[PDB]
Write a protein that binds this ligand. Structure first.
Ligand SMILES: [Cu+2]
Lengths: 30, 30, 30
């Protein structure tokens, strides 16, 4: 139902935030 | 409700499109 | 409706998995 969808949004939003962190590291590490 | 979920989909979809643009720049800039 | 939302989640989840594959290739190819 709606609650299930909202829980999958939050997971997707955490997948995206981590991707953004990896992208930053690819550009700036070192 | 459903409308709220659809508005968070559209935001997620814009987060992803920008990520794809940054990935392209990482590979091809210069 | 809910089914439509679930179909857009699955698409988003495939967009993310491919992004993760491209990120891995950027780091490790070669
Ligand atoms: Cu969603």
């Amino acid at each position: 139902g709606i609650a299930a969808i909202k829980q999958e949004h939050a997971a997707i939003k955490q997948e995206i935030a981590a991707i953004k962190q990896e992208i930053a590291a690819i550009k700036w590490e070192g």
